[PDB]
């Protein structure tokens, strides 16, 4: 139950923000019928926006990062495909080991 409340917390932040009583009756003058329609609409749309269990999420994520890497191609910092190779196989020594001091 706590994990559920956690999982929608930012969505509820937005939700309460948009459905402010003043805003519900002033910015866009909703009537009761329309407000109930909106409330049901959001429940259906959200519940449709759940991860369907069974998705091969790891393979999708791997390809999701790998495809734009193919597109990667051309202030002296190490970035791009070589940086990605550094990141990926935990390079003990790095071409650009830097630090940003606050």
């Amino acid at each position: 139950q706590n994990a559920q409340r956690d999982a929608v917390t930012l969505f509820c932040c937005l939700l309460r923000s948009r459905l402010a009583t003043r805003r519900v009756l002033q910015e866009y003058r909703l009537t009761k019928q329309a407000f109930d329609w909106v409330l049901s609409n959001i429940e259906a749309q959200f519940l449709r926006s759940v991860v369907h269990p069974g998705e091969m999420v790891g393979v999708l994520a791997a390809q999701s990062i790998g495809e734009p890497a193919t597109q990667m191609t051309l202030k002296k910092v190490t970035s791009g495909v070589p940086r990605l190779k550094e990141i990926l196989n935990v390079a003990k020594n790095m071409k650009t080991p830097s630090l940003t001091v606050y």
Partner: protein
């Protein structure tokens, strides 16, 4: 051996794309093999559309068996399972 009781179940009642597609494929496969049709098809001659229309009126008598990571399972009848 063990089962998950009907009263206490906590899996998405809405059927996922994967079980809908599997169920439609099972229905269409068996429909292709001279199987009985449980709706008054409106001239439909395709097992894919036939299975979709059986599902839409919930005339498909199959049950899912969602398997959990512990080895336990949860049966969900097609009546129970919703479609948006």
């Amino acid at each position: 051996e063990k089962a998950i009781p009907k009263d206490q179940r906590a899996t998405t009642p809405y059927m996922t794309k994967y079980e809908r597609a599997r169920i439609l494929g099972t229905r269409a496969l068996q429909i292709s093999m001279n199987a009985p049709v449980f709706v008054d098809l409106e001239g439909e001659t395709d097992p894919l559309r036939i299975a979709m229309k059986e599902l839409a009126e919930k005339k498909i008598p199959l049950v899912i068996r969602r398997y959990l990571p512990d080895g336990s399972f949860e049966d969900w009848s097609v009546e129970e399972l919703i479609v948006d």
